[PDB]
Design a protein around this nucleic acid. Structure first.
Lengths: 53, 128, 187, 147
RNA sequence: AAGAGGGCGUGAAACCGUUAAGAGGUAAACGGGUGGGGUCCGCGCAGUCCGCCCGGAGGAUUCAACCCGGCGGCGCGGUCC
RNA sequence: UGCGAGUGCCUAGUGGGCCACUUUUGGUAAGCAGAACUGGCGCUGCGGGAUGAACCGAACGCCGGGUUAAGGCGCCCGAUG
RNA sequence: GCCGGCAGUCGGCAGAGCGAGAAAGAGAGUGGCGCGGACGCUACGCCGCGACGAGUAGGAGGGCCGCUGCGGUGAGCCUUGAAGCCUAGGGCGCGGGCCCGGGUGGAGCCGCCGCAGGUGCAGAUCUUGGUGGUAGUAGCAAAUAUUCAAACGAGAACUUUG
């Protein structure tokens, strides 16, 4: 029921989106997981560059 | 004699009886605390004659006679000795008042300190 | 009883600024005293304009200040603005200026000082001209916001040029039945 | 901050700020943009004209990379280069005419909006406007294309 | 500490038992206004002090003005270094 | 003759009404149905009409004195005892 | 609502005013003894006039109204007694509610500045749990029937024996 000059909005919430909500509380832990594996990758190849070829 | 206030005006109050909530006499679950009647057909809300009175702004006391005791002082809560010296410039129109949580061991020390600074205490002998 | 319409009894003008900052209130404190003591009506407008909201005192472009200060008569004259001074990139030459404002952007500040100008604050304005003598009061475009293009007469009304509220501009989202002579009607 | 919400001031009022005759039911008008043509037609006519119907042709696989064409006007032209470029102009008895590469900064078409200060230039852009040329040629510059 | 006694940290209200007081034929209850009777409070019951001056009765190792030392404020010292 | 005026945004609730002086449609008539202006109840307490939607007066912050409107002044019940 | 007033507490570095019918200064110049003066101004404060004060649905503003937890803060309170509960005690605020006195209680709790919410009940034939009037009332009535003496026991219409 639109009233007095809003945009015609089309929210894509008609599916059961609450079962498939992806939270991003893993972001700081994933950054540590990627970083601690990045340092460990660079220590196995001691003289080689960390970025690769 | 005691510690008299600096000025003693005639304290007048427009209404001294408490404001009673509607139908609190009939029921027990309705407390004495006032609630505004917001019904569609209520005798209290539209001010029918011979009913209870609703609290309005006109029942407010004069700004000069507000918040004094019958003795003529304003209350101020006191916890310890350190908060007693702040009233050293207000002892002629303000009284010290001791909290319920003050132990009897240091309650006596506040009372005799208030005598030295000539500050009235409304509860000088509470715990003894 | 008295038959008085009480719906317009309370005026809706501003009394105190809604900001909780202390530098603006000190400037309000300074100009509160000058408004009710001095006979200068300039200080009353500044005090009135120091109560406005952020969307109410629009930024003043630098080139509009140059355009409005090159008028004949106002030479050796200071310009006082209540909003903010912002740089304009489409102006090349800038003369010597004397500008007073609450805030000047860093790019516009270095441009005025390079040309030998002078940027003052409103506390130094009271020390220079407490009555505001020899001052020019300017302001930015009040209707220059994008918000005001959605106001006025409603769209879908003949001889109305209001921007509609559209999520994104495309060929098939609008300009159809209601806008085309081929599709139903147009206004 | 729920303590500044309107709901805290509505504690006690029976209707909770939503009417006594017409109660706040579930969906009186219909869910979403229900009834574009029926019973909500006036709101769609006098606030969103041209909402209904087809217009134009359909381009199926439309890629924004082909239609990329950012524009820059002549009024904001000397900001593309540094300040010391333009002060080292109209000087040295040569007519230095510095080259401003529009494609280098990230613009393609050059438009003629604004007033150009009197200094001949060389502009390198993929596209140009007719009114763009006569301002540069009127000043005394020249336009050079690039791909 | 059982005024913590085996579903036992405190033990509210509805309800009930008993004691003290009061009242009772227009169901009970309520608002305004008083009056009477109670339980406690003002630890009241010869009634508040605060400054200046006057009188006579008493006491200090004391007042003003000077000397030394220290600290602080101000200085358009027209314009000290 | 009196009054400080203009203007821009959002925006709840409402979209079952009723009564009365006057005009008036259908109906024998209706506390019936349906229209116009204005005022009320709705949303509003108060004095009066014994009682009370819309009747008369009059609209309301809490009080003291004085004076009234409409109504009244044998008693209930204030006032022609 | 007032173009409201108050930065002027400008003090031997002084002269204490701008309520007063009339557009503007208690303005600068140059020739003819005794050390003295009440309050104040959280300028989101203080003070002065005038008008007004109803209210459903509804909207806005102020809460030094209230609950829970968090960051600071009170050299905060507390086994010489915290929370909770009761109170014919004393009170405050128009009001939301709040502060003390007494009693029980024994271990944590409160004020201010901001933050956050699962934050305030009289109803919803609301949910759970408890308790009343009814009320010592309806009732303990379908199928013919019990009586006498003794025993056990503290106790027998109902058990056992004859």
């Amino acid at each position: 029921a639109p009233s007095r000059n809003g945009m015609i909005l089309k929210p894509h919430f008609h599916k059961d989106w609450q079962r498939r909500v992806a939270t991003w509380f893993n972001q700081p832990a994933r950054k540590i997981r990627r970083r601690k594996a990045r340092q460990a990758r660079a220590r196995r190849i001691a003289p080689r560059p960390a970025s690769g070829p | 004699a005691a510690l008299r206030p600096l000025v003693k005006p005639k304290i007048v109050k427009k209404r001294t009886k408490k404001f009673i909530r509607h139908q609190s006499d009939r029921y027990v679950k309705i407390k004495r605390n006032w609630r505004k009647p917001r019904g569609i057909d209520n005798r209290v809300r539209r001010r029918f004659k011979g009913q209870i009175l609703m609290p309005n702004i006109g029942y407010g006391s004069n700004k000069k006679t507000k918040h004094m005791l019958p003795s003529g002082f304003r209350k101020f809560l006191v916890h310890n000795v350190k908060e007693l010296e702040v009233l050293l410039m207000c002892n002629k129109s303000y009284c010290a008042e001791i909290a319920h949580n003050v132990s009897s061991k240091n309650r006596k020390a506040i009372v005799e300190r208030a005598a030295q600074l000539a500050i009235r205490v409304t509860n000088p002998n509470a715990r003894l | 009883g008295v038959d008085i319409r009480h719906n317009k009894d309370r005026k809706v003008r501003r009394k105190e600024p809604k900001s909780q900052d202390i530098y603006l209130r000190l400037l309000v404190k300074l100009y509160r005293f000058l408004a009710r003591r001095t006979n200068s009506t300039f200080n009353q407008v500044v005090l009135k304009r120091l109560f406005m909201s952020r969307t109410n005192r629009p930024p003043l472009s630098l080139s509009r200040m140059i355009r409005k200060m090159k008028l004949p008569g106002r030479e050796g004259k200071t310009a006082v603005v209540v909003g903010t001074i912002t740089d304009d990139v489409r102006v090349q030459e800038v003369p010597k200026l004397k500008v007073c404002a609450l805030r000047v952007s860093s790019r516009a500040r270095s441009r005025i000082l390079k040309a030998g100008g002078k940027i003052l604050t409103f506390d130094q304005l009271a020390l220079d001209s407490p009555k505001g003598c020899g001052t020019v009061l300017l302001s930015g475009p009040r209707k220059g916001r994008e918000v005001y293009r959605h106001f006025g007469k409603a769209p879908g009304t003949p001889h109305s040029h209001t921007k509609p509220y559209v999520r994104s501009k495309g060929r098939k989202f609008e300009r159809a039945r209601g806008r085309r002579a081929s599709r139903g009607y147009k206004n | 901050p729920s303590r500044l919400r309107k709901t805290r001031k509505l504690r006690g009022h029976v209707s909770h700020g939503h009417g006594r005759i017409g109660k706040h039911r579930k969906h009186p008008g219909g869910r979403g943009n229900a009834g574009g043509m029926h019973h909500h037609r006036i709101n769609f006519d006098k606030y969103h004209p041209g909402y209904f119907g087809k217009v134009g042709m359909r381009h199926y696989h439309l890629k924004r990379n082909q239609s990329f064409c950012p524009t820059v006007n002549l009024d904001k032209l000397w900001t593309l280069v540094s300040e010391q470029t333009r002060v080292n102009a109209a000087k040295n008895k040569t007519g230095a005419a510095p080259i401003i590469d529009v494609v280098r900064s990230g613009y393609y078409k050059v438009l003629g909006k604004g007033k150009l200060p009197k200094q001949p230039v060389i502009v390198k852009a993929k596209f140009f406007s007719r009114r763009a040329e006569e301002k540069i040629k009127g000043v005394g510059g020249a336009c050079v294309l690039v791909a």
